[PDB]
Design a protein around this ligand. Sequence first.
Ligand SMILES: *[C@@H]1O[C@H](CO)[C@@H](O)[C@H](O)[C@H]1NC(C)=O
Ligand SMILES: *[C@@H]1O[C@H](CO)[C@@H](O)[C@H](O)[C@H]1NC(C)=O
Lengths: 352, 352, 352, 352
Amino acid sequence: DVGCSVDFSKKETRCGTGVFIYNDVEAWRDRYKYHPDSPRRLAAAVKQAWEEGICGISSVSRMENIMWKSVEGELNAILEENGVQLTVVVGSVKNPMWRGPQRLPVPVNELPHGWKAWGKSYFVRAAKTNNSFVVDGDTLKECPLEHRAWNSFLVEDHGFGVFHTSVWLKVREDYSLECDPAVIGTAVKGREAAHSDLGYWIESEKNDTWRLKRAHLIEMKTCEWPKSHTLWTDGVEESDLIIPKSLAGPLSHHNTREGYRTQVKGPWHSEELEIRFEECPGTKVYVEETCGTRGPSLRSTTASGRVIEEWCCRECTMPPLSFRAKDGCWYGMEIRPRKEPESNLVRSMVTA
Amino acid sequence: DVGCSVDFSKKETRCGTGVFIYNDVEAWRDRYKYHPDSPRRLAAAVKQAWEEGICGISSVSRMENIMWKSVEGELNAILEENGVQLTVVVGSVKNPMWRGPQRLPVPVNELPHGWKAWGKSYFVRAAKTNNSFVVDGDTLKECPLEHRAWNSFLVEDHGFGVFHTSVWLKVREDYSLECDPAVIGTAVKGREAAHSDLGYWIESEKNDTWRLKRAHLIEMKTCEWPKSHTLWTDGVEESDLIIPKSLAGPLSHHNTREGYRTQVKGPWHSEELEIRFEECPGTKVYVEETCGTRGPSLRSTTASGRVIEEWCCRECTMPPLSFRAKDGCWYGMEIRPRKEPESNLVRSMVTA
Amino acid sequence: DVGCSVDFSKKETRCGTGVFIYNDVEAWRDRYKYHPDSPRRLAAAVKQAWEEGICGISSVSRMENIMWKSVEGELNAILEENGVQLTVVVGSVKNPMWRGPQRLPVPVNELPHGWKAWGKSYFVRAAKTNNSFVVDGDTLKECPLEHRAWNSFLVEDHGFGVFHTSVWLKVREDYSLECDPAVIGTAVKGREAAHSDLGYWIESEKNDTWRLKRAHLIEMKTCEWPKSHTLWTDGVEESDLIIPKSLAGPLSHHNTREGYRTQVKGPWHSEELEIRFEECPGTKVYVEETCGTRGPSLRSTTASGRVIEEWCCRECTMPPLSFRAKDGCWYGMEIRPRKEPESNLVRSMVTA
Amino acid sequence: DVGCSVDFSKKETRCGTGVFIYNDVEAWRDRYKYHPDSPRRLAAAVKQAWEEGICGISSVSRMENIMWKSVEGELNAILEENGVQLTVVVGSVKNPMWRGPQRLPVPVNELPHGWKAWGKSYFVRAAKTNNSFVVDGDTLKECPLEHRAWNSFLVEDHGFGVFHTSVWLKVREDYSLECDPAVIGTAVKGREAAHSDLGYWIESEKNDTWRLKRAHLIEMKTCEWPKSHTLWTDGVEESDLIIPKSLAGPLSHHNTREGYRTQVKGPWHSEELEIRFEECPGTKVYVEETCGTRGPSLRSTTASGRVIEEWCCRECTMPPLSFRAKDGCWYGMEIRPRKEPESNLVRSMVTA
Ligand SMILES: *[C@@H]1O[C@H](CO)[C@@H](O)[C@H](O)[C@H]1NC(C)=O
Ligand SMILES: *[C@@H]1O[C@H](CO)[C@@H](O)[C@H](O)[C@H]1NC(C)=O
């Protein structure tokens, strides 16, 4: 990779070989195609899974859901044309994207019909059938999470990633609990580190020790960050990782901070989350030894919009840990209201 | 931090934000032009060290030796302006750069007055004395190894919009055994990892497993690579690292290969070394259980230049491991000749 | 302009000073956001334009239309506060954007600012009223072209945008048929040339002569390209400008190719367009003197998706001219099917 | 290509792809070592030229003269060993270089490469052959302009050079009065224009109209600027070109200014000029209709260093034109002294 950079603290400039890591979270990437292997093979796999009793799918990330939405209609058309009666219906992703115990089997043979749908870009109708292969969506009662598949697709190549911008996939053969390595990038240079993938951008710094600086999450996954793509992965205890290991947080020393423990019960139901170590607007935080213990994260403002003004923490170190979302400004587990009834506090919905 | 990018494998052009890592190994010639912070205080420290029994400084990296060689004149003048009797003699760098029990003291106060040094750094006139604060060189007899100082210099700032960017060093405050963190860059992106600093460039890739691909060594240090700049340092035994831990090799799973132990007795005396996994030119290797055991490495050609074309090893995996040096191609420790007297084989020099 | 680059024909690096022109059409992230300098001045001007008989204004460029979309709410709210009966409603893009006889007159005064208008924008669009300053849209029946403004804006200044350069505008004073020069950029570096603005990119090259090499269009203006920013204007015949002078094509010898002429009946209805000189999969052209005459472009495939493979050209040169739109390949006005019914050909309506 | 930029005019740091044109004259960063692509073939060319009767060659560009002096020894070493009596002597360039009425003969076949001539360079010379093939210099008496070769070479290609690219050359089989178009570069960006090559750097901008701004000439060619690299060719009259078309002034409206005619009697005998528009040090020009006629350029200081302070111009414009050479400032044709004897004035020379 031949490329350049322009420093912002200073203004030095230089171009030359190396390794370049790009922030695709705030950039919002671009339009993509997401060719899930051979649409015929995907149709055969979904039919075979339906035979076994796999009633639906829960997207692991926000690219798989978009791929399913894109190929919905054309998969339905392929199914109708063949001697198969099954409808694929998709929906909206609800965070956090929970786990599933099933995997889509790889078909032994392709369906016996013409393969004119390679790259099918939707734009086709089909007849509705009673039995449906629900994907994501609010079809919880219809298809319980028990019989739902999860993490079955494996990125293969990035053919024509400059202008076409297509990410090709294929159904994986072996069981795994691991996130996709192909879209992960980690880097450290001097006193700045950054772990990231298509939806996570974590930043760490050095101040007498390596610690967490800032994080921007546009989704809440549940896979496991691979160890081969994380820095300093020895002697680390899981009780100190700010982003729990159950939400795809690196198992690393850069993933911690002094005075804080695992944030397992935060506002993980939001759509966009930014972790900033700074006081919530209009509120003050102090360290007192009489403050309460750790519990669910609470929002700064009440239901009617009134702002709370005094907060306390037991052992946290300023500046505090606060989550920023479209709903408002939240606070960490260690930070509790100084004096306020629990009625007006909007606890986060527990994530189990 | 915005930067260029063009990958020739995919011809993809990108422009974004993040962390950009560069290969600064070729530019070892003239990467910098500077002097340590306030060479007046450096002269004070040198004198105080001389009073306490520090007769020499064995450099740890080629950058440090170059700094000493480029500041010799000004430091000598500052010594021969107050009344100090000390001669700084800077020799050549002998690989591998070895260790020093002692450390350079931090002075309490500067010298009484050295303003003449201001504005007079390169073209400075002084005289010679009897006392010799030798810096490396071929002076083991004069100042033995046990009385030298080693790895007592840090970095504060570096890089500028110029061909030679000033680097402001500083005397270390406390004991330490690790290489300089400020000049290390690690990065993994998909199936390509890169560990690197100003003299090392180690490359790894995934082929059904994370392995070692290639390594370029312009020096042979003896510090210890910091773990905070290492990928996947969990559950790794030090007997499998290809580049030993005693020659500042990363303690990671990316720093090994299957069928090869640690290479303690390689050709660590060369000026420039490249580690490659490919058959040594003109020769061939076979996998046989009746070949020789582990020991010092051997050169492909004899003293007169005769090419040895037959080699064997017990349990290695092809392609073999060969060290490429200015002298020539050298084989791995586990690879031995099938039919050749040990008198005709050049044994590598091992320094412990 | 302090900066630098990497030449990828020879793979060389060099940092210095000069003039730098960038390819702003194929940009990963947006850098320019049209805005109005004085929304009060714009609102007064809009009211007066309606009073003298302008029912709407056709956007000249997509980015001006985006600005109109953004301002719609604030303009409606502020007009309603004072009591003005005007209701700005913006339609969707239709290509090309036809020129209008009228010009937005410069307002005599400035519209007053309401107390609640501070910060009220992007969501305060007002109800439809008798006076409706429609903008763009495929609704010319409501607003005839003869009573539509066109190109009444100027680049007052280039505001500083760290992430997105904000460009503020003021109502034009001079009636001109010329594009905005504040965003134009032309260059020749030996044999490579480039004409560009916000939405155009016309590459050119040298092979025994100066000929068109490629292009890219994300809109379809109707301005006239200034000669001050054109290379080799003199001596050109308008009948040979590939991109017609009516659609803002440069008047130069760089805007031409041998064997072709003005393409005025091309796929100018497409939303985006890549003019490329080569055949695309599933076709073939043979230079034959008996082929058909010059007529509107015909897509390679049929309405049912069947591809015509035999093509003939009268006096063309290989490779041919094919426009890559969002639907698929097309072939220039000099390229006709060898043998195919006219019914199965998707002709493109001439834009005039 | 992808490029750096930290422009300090607007402090807008930008990156992207496009065309980058670098200043090379004002910075004197002539980082190109001119060489012949086939220095061996040139011996046959000079021999054939001498057979016809070309007594000498006058350089068209300072870099051609640099090449000639660099290859003087290369040619002289071989010429003695092929039974050829011809010695090339390269002098100094006398600005402004003149237009010669012939070119070198086209080579017939390759001249054999001698064994001992190989490796001989400008450190070894021929021993005073009877006929001397002079290059440049004040040898007009020895060989007049009437038999001088002029502009017979063209840049063949660009060699690879980290710090100094080796420009390659080849003989032209044609008669063209045009400058080397493979080292030219032109560009307009918003309001910023620049016509450039190895030795010229003309600058232009807009203030109510496109007018010349400044220039920097480190030589005085006599080639004609091609119009394929000029902005706004059409409509220009040669009589208005500030820098004469005979001294390689671009044919455009950026090459001209209002209130000035062509300056064909300027200080064209200098060694380097900086044309600029501002009053000479401590002088004053008045606008009076009774001033003198157009005439040579008169320096501000007389032969003894006395300054003239009162100047006039009839159809004048301000700030005035004044070319700054290494001897001092001069005033344009239209600017004449109000009251001063003609004997104390300095008059330039026209190299028709
Ligand atoms: C961070 O480090 C700097 C020096 O690098 C130190 O002065 C500062 O106190 C540290 N902490 C904060 C919160 O800035
Ligand atoms: C892995 O290595 C083997 C042997 O070196 C080679 O044949 C193969 O192409 C490599 N690549 C992969 C993806 O396994």
